[PDB]
Write a protein that binds this ligand. Structure first.
Ligand SMILES: [K+]
Ligand SMILES: [K+]
Ligand SMILES: [K+]
Ligand SMILES: [K+]
Ligand SMILES: [Mg+2]
Ligand SMILES: [Mg+2]
Ligand SMILES: [Mg+2]
Ligand SMILES: [Mg+2]
Ligand SMILES: [Mg+2]
Ligand SMILES: [Mg+2]
Ligand SMILES: [Mg+2]
Ligand SMILES: [Mg+2]
Ligand SMILES: [Mg+2]
Ligand SMILES: [Mg+2]
Ligand SMILES: [Mg+2]
Ligand SMILES: [Mg+2]
Ligand SMILES: [Mg+2]
Ligand SMILES: [Mg+2]
Ligand SMILES: [Mg+2]
Ligand SMILES: [Mg+2]
Ligand SMILES: [Mg+2]
Ligand SMILES: [Mg+2]
Ligand SMILES: [Mg+2]
Ligand SMILES: [Mg+2]
Ligand SMILES: [Mg+2]
Ligand SMILES: [Mg+2]
Ligand SMILES: [Mg+2]
Ligand SMILES: [Mg+2]
Ligand SMILES: [Mg+2]
Ligand SMILES: [Mg+2]
Ligand SMILES: [Mg+2]
Ligand SMILES: [Mg+2]
Ligand SMILES: [Mg+2]
Ligand SMILES: [Mg+2]
Ligand SMILES: [Mg+2]
Ligand SMILES: [Mg+2]
Ligand SMILES: [Mg+2]
Ligand SMILES: [Mg+2]
Ligand SMILES: [Mg+2]
Ligand SMILES: [Mg+2]
Ligand SMILES: [Mg+2]
Ligand SMILES: [Mg+2]
Ligand SMILES: [Mg+2]
Ligand SMILES: [Mg+2]
Ligand SMILES: [Mg+2]
Ligand SMILES: [Mg+2]
Ligand SMILES: [Mg+2]
Ligand SMILES: [Mg+2]
Ligand SMILES: [Mg+2]
Ligand SMILES: [Mg+2]
Ligand SMILES: [Mg+2]
Ligand SMILES: [Mg+2]
Ligand SMILES: [Mg+2]
Ligand SMILES: [Mg+2]
Ligand SMILES: [Mg+2]
Ligand SMILES: [Mg+2]
Ligand SMILES: [Mg+2]
Ligand SMILES: [Mg+2]
Ligand SMILES: [Mg+2]
Ligand SMILES: [Mg+2]
Ligand SMILES: [Mg+2]
Ligand SMILES: [Mg+2]
Ligand SMILES: [Mg+2]
Ligand SMILES: [Mg+2]
Ligand code: NA
Ligand code: NA
Ligand code: NA
Ligand SMILES: [Zn+2]
Lengths: 96, 124, 50, 81
RNA sequence: AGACCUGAGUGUGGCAGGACUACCCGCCGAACUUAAGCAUAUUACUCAGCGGAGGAAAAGAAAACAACCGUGAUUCUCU
RNA sequence: CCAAAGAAGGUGUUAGCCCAUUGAGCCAUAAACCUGAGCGCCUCAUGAAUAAGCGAGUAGCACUGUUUGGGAAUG
RNA sequence: GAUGUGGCCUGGAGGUUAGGACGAAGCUUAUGGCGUGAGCCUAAGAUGGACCGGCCUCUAGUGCAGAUCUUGGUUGGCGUAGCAAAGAUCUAACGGAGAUAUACUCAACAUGCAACGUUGGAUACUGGAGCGGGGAAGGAUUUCGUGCCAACGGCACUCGUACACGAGUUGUUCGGAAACUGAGCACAACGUUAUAUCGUUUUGUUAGGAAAGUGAAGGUGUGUCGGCGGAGCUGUUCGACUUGAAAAGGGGCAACAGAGAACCUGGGAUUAUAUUCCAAAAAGAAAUUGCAUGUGGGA
RNA sequence: AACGUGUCGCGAUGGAUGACUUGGCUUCCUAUUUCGUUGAAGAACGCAGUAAAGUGCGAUAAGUGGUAUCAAUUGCAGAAUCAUUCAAUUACCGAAUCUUUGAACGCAAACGGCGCAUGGGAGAAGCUCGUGUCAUCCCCGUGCAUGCCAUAUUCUCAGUGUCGA
């Protein structure tokens, strides 16, 4: 192989999920829709966002909706399964 | 509360890789602090953590390249060395005649040089 | 309109992020020469045509 | 008539952004750039515009690698013992 | 059967393409202008155009000058 | 008062002596470079004490074209 | 038009001799004196704040009133020409600093005018080929909320497509691509050109042109079956692994209105998105691919 | 009268002049001084606690490492130590990193698109005893343009070419 750089497999999910959003719209979706809002890698995937959510937060996502914002960033609307509570994981994440 | 370069160099690959994960996780938690207000003491920790990740990766890549260099330094595997590990120099210098080839001589040229060597002399 | 290439959309995104005034603390630096952003853009004055 | 009224008859684009130089000189229909001649392998370079040559020559950009190799040459490719 | 001649396929190891281009090497190559007009001429074996190198390039070891009591690869300087 | 240092910058007015400069000298060095063609070892190379030919679609020449100070023709 | 001038002036150089924080250069003048003049010098600054004068010689990008001269600024015209197509606004209340804003005299008018936004009424216009509701091209945050009124919206604004801050664009089925061909393009190939940055390249179709790596059937092993006679054996069907029929004419782009294409209602679901969001009674009802498992039936 | 005119003192508008100069122009010199498929020049995105431009840098992103040097940087803030060093800051450079592209070269392209090989990774279906394994789907690495040269433990072939069996 012509590529010899060491790449860690346990840190890929940290690039996929960057940070949550705490806007007024984002907080509304947590309560009535069990949905978390995140800024994700702009080249990331809906399938890969689901896997990253499992690794980083040990929650199961039933649906991921993505959009590329007008400022160039990619935002993900992640609905967690009814087994998990979005408010509870939001407290664990630290956004409350 | 960062990583010092001295103790990173006596760690193994697994301990370095394990340490890299903890700092990546800590940085990701600090990104949440950036968005949701955040105390200014915590925001001052982002740069030290980011440099620690760079230090860990620097040691990992330095060790890997040095190891692969002596692995392919063997007699039989030298010709199969990846081009990323070969000496860079310059495109022209790599293709230029080496000193050994540039200095090649014919049999007649060698005999002439030995028969009539250049001398050292002076005039009174 | 609705259609644009993603590369065009990303160029317009960068122009949007650059269309900001100078932060106030910049003007308080020791050897500062910047008073206002001289490359401010308005959609009615100058066009980008991406 | 020609003039103000015909200015409103101008629709579409002749040129879009070029992948190689980003100059908005890529002829959409002819599929080539008026500024750098992309996708031709060699660029446009004419001595009747020395001013245009100086706008695009080496050193007008970043020289990300040329800076490094110049230092290596100036230091005779120094390597550790 | 096989050979060797010609020509293919693939594996293995390499090289070319682009940039720069002040100076240098090869080609291509105008006109304005001057001639108190203008066509040969001049501008000029120049500009523009197309190629190719290097720290220089090109040239270079006599199928050379001379006509002398002879000189002695190439390049450059005064003349 | 210094000067083998007057040297031209800085410092709140015009500075040899307020600061930095201005010299012998000291320390450290991938390779390369220079030095009884520096100096050892192994290996490998190496010096000294009878006739024949010599560059062919080449040189010439003719016509045309071009270039040259080169003119019954310089390339 | 020629020439002369111990003739004048400007920026620098080699010399010489001076001045300046007790104030250099520059600038200002009913500051006078000197010179025929170019100019020189002094005075004052209720100017300035750090350099600079004389004389000899040297030197040059060395003297401005005009070139429809160049650049910057200013200026009368001049509070002038005008700001007249698209019919139009009125009223009360609320909001706002934008008022009912006052020496004397004085009951109110004759001394704070004129102008704003919102809401309710009134009146009118657009009149479905609309100052209606959605899209393409083009634009790219103008969208939304809050705040704000220096500049800008040629009058005005408390308003704004202005400014500031903070938000907003959610798809298995919608459009595109994946994945069609068209007028066409021109990579490869070949040829040409001193030079490829030239030409050919859909009239079924590249190239003097060996451009197919795909594979019927077999043979040979494996897996799921079948039948026969005595869990195995022979033969056999069908999928996986290892002999070669026939398939001429390289690789690609070009349609967001042609071809193609599996979703459509309800919502109390937004400040701004929605056949894109809604979560167990999904408000819900479907349709479609790709894999699988089990059941039923064949092999 | 009023407009208007002239002079002087003081103001405004307007930015000349002088002094200042980390800039330009011109001349001269010194070199183990000359890029790129080991992917250049150029172009595009991004990166700071705070960061629009510019500068520097590349997901290790106003920088990692190593040598010196010796206490800062500085608008604010933050910061173990007040420092032999392991963490100040500068300077230099041997070790590294180096996103999308571009000669750009797997195929394309107003498409952050789509492949064929070969390595991996994650896999809540299914099988297995929450552990293993893992279909479809998804993510990442490397190879894969054309031409030419050399080569083949002496690789596989073609020709009513020339022979020979
Ligand atoms: K000539
Ligand atoms: K006189
Ligand atoms: K003017
Ligand atoms: K062509
Ligand atoms: Mg997505
Ligand atoms: Mg979407
Ligand atoms: Mg539109
Ligand atoms: Mg557009
Ligand atoms: Mg038209
Ligand atoms: Mg018409
Ligand atoms: Mg057209
Ligand atoms: Mg087209
Ligand atoms: Mg002329
Ligand atoms: Mg003439
Ligand atoms: Mg004439
Ligand atoms: Mg004439
Ligand atoms: Mg030329
Ligand atoms: Mg030389
Ligand atoms: Mg030579
Ligand atoms: Mg000679
Ligand atoms: Mg001084
Ligand atoms: Mg010294
Ligand atoms: Mg010796
Ligand atoms: Mg001869
Ligand atoms: Mg001949
Ligand atoms: Mg001639
Ligand atoms: Mg001739
Ligand atoms: Mg002739
Ligand atoms: Mg001058
Ligand atoms: Mg003097
Ligand atoms: Mg006066
Ligand atoms: Mg006067
Ligand atoms: Mg004088
Ligand atoms: Mg003049
Ligand atoms: Mg004047
Ligand atoms: Mg005039
Ligand atoms: Mg006026
Ligand atoms: Mg009027
Ligand atoms: Mg009018
Ligand atoms: Mg009207
Ligand atoms: Mg009303
Ligand atoms: Mg009143
Ligand atoms: Mg009133
Ligand atoms: Mg009507
Ligand atoms: Mg009507
Ligand atoms: Mg009607
Ligand atoms: Mg309408
Ligand atoms: Mg609005
Ligand atoms: Mg107005
Ligand atoms: Mg705005
Ligand atoms: Mg904003
Ligand atoms: Mg034809
Ligand atoms: Mg066609
Ligand atoms: Mg074709
Ligand atoms: Mg044909
Ligand atoms: Mg197409
Ligand atoms: Mg369209
Ligand atoms: Mg259609
Ligand atoms: Mg569709
Ligand atoms: Mg809307
Ligand atoms: Mg690269
Ligand atoms: Mg490509
Ligand atoms: Mg290509
Ligand atoms: Mg034969
Ligand atoms: Na333009
Ligand atoms: Na030495
Ligand atoms: Na009027
Ligand atoms: Zn271009």
């Amino acid at each position: 192989s012509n590529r010899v750089t060491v790449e860690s497999k346990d840190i890929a999910a940290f690039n996929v999920i960057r940070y949550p959003l705490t806007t007024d719209k984002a907080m509304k979706k947590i309560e009535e829709n069990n949905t978390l809002t995140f800024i994700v890698d702009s080249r990331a995937n809906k399938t890969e966002i689901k896997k990253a959510m499992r690794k980083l937060y040990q929650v199961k996502a039933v649906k991921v909706n993505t959009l590329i914002r007008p400022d160039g960033l990619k935002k993900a609307y992640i609905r967690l399964s009814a087994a998990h509570d979005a408010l509870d994981t939001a407290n664990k994440i630290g956004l409350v | 509360h960062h990583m010092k370069i001295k103790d990173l160099r006596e760690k193994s690959k697994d301990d370095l890789l394990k340490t890299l994960t903890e700092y990546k996780k800590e940085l990701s938690q600090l990104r949440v602090v950036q968005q949701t207000g955040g105390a200014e003491t915590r925001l001052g920790r982002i740069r030290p953590i980011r440099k620690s990740i760079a230090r860990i990766l620097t040691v990992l890549n330095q060790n890997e390249r040095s190891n692969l260099k002596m692995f392919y330094a063997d007699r039989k595997l030298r010709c199969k060395t990846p081009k990323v590990l070969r000496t860079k120099l310059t495109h022209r210098r790599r293709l230029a005649l080496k000193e050994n080839e540039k200095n090649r001589k014919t049999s007649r040229q060698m005999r002439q040089a030995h028969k009539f060597p250049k001398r050292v002399y002076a005039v009174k | 309109g609705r259609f644009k290439p993603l590369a065009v959309k990303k160029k317009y995104a960068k122009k949007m992020n650059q269309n900001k005034p100078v932060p106030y603390w910049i003007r308080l630096r020791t050897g500062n020469r910047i008073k206002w952003n001289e490359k401010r853009r308005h959609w009615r004055r100058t066009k980008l045509n991406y | 008539t020609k003039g103000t009224t015909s200015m409103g008859q101008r629709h579409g684009r002749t040129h879009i952004l070029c992948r190689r130089c980003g100059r908005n000189s890529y002829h959409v229909q002819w599929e080539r750039c008026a500024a750098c001649a992309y996708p031709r392998a060699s660029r446009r370079r004419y001595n009747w515009s020395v001013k245009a040559i100086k706008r695009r020559r080496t050193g007008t950009g970043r020289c990300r690698y040329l800076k490094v190799v110049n230092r290596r040459i100036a230091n005779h490719f120094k390597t550790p013992k």
